[PDB]
Amino acid sequence: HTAPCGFVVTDAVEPDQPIIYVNTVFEMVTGYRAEEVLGGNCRFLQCRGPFAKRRHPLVDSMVVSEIRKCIDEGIEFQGELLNFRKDGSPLMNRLRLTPIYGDDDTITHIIGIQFFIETDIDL
Amino acid sequence: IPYPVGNLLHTAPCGFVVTDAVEPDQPIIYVNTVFEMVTGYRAEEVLGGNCRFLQCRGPFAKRRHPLVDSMVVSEIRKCIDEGIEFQGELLNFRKDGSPLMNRLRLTPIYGDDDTITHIIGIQFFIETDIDLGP
Ligand SMILES: Cc1cc2nc3c(=O)[nH]c(=O)nc-3n(C[C@H](O)[C@H](O)[C@H](O)COP(=O)(O)O)c2cc1C
Ligand SMILES: Cc1cc2nc3c(=O)[nH]c(=O)nc-3n(C[C@H](O)[C@H](O)[C@H](O)COP(=O)(O)O)c2cc1C
């Protein structure tokens, strides 16, 4: 009895969607513990390991920019992009985002659902 | 020597539900611990079935309670059927029969074939003035 996907919840009211919650599948597949990711953005998953300072070149710029647009416009998203576990191994992430609307027609949260998929790998 | 996974579960802010969009009538293949804790129903009891049982007042009412709004329920059927998102607020009930106010979001997952393979349901059980009590 275990989830088929990663779940992530961000606070859409604070700036830049800080993570307030990740599920155990997120933790187990990416190798990052909740306690090291809370209060920050998920884009760290696009840098190869905890110490790369730049978005890795094999993650699709075009897809990343679609995420920005969708978040900006308060609409849902789905796409595939390269991520990396804490140990730097690559990881393919079939990601879906959906916003949660509060009373005032303002967004309180975004939900992230990650369907992880692995690869042939290099490096 | 590892750090355990799942230390902050107690802080999960919402229920999560996953259904199989391919089998008939959206059978549940996963629910999270919040769902379990808030609704009072354990996974073993709900897996394999449709989520609609929550509109019945407790486990012994066979049908949806007269007070849940059929228009919202209709909007849900529509969104599931058309393959699109849904958000709305829906009267539900715990296993003990107390009212829950469910701020439900549904979002479909498209697989390889550009085919919906799952639906995700997210439940923010929210503060409500609704009370049916003694
Ligand atoms: C709820 C939520 C979950 C997200 N989950 C992931 C994820 O699992 N992997 C990933 O690479 N990006 C994820 N993102 C995307 C990044 O947070 C970010 O929004 C994206 O990289 C675009 O912003 P940027 O160009 O400023 O980096 C998620 C975003 C949100 C709001
Ligand atoms: C992923 C998913 C999650 C759902 N979660 C709930 C829920 O938490 N509470 C609820 O009353 N209905 C939920 N539903 C809705 C019912 O399963 C059903 O689709 C709805 O009652 C409309 O169909 P019906 O009129 O045949 O019962 C969910 C549906 C899906 C697909």
Author numbering:
A (entry chain A): 13 to 135
B (entry chain B): 4 to 137
Copy the relevant paper text.
A plant called Arabidopsis thaliana has a light-sensitive protein called ZEITLUPE (or ZTL for short) that helps it keep its circadian clock in sync with the cycle of night and day. In Arabidopsis thaliana, three LOV domain containing proteins ZTL, FLAVIN-BINDING, KELCH REPEAT, F-BOX 1 (FKF1), and LOV KELCH PROTEIN 2 (LKP2) act in circadian timing and seasonal flowering. Recent research indicates that their divergent roles in the circadian clock and photoperiodic flowering may enable interrogation of how chemistry regulates PAS/LOV protein function to select for signaling pathways. These proteins retain analogous elements, where an N-terminal LOV domain regulates activity of a C-terminal E3 ubiquitin ligase to target clock proteins for degradation in a time dependent manner. LOV domains are typified by blue-light induced formation of a C4a adduct between a conserved Cys residue and a bound flavin (FAD, FMN or riboflavin) cofactor.
Towards these aims we solved 2.5 Å, 2.6 Å, and 2.1 Å crystal structures of dark-state WT ZTL, G80R and V48I:G80R (residues 29–165) respectively. Consistent with solution studies, the crystallographic lattice is defined by two sets of anti-parallel dimers formed by extensive contacts along the β-scaffold. In contrast to other LOV proteins, where a conserved Gln (Q154) acts as a molecular bridge linking the FMN to a residue in Aβ, the dark-state structure of ZTL contains a heterogeneous orientation of the active site Q154. The altered orientation is coupled to contacts in the Ncap, Ccap and helical interface. In this manner an unusual orientation of Q154 links the Iβ-Ccap hinge and helical interface through a QFF motif (Q154-F155-F156). Rather, we propose that steric interactions involving the flavin O4 position and G46 shift a dynamic equilibrium in the Q154 position to stabilize the ZTL protein in a light-state configuration.
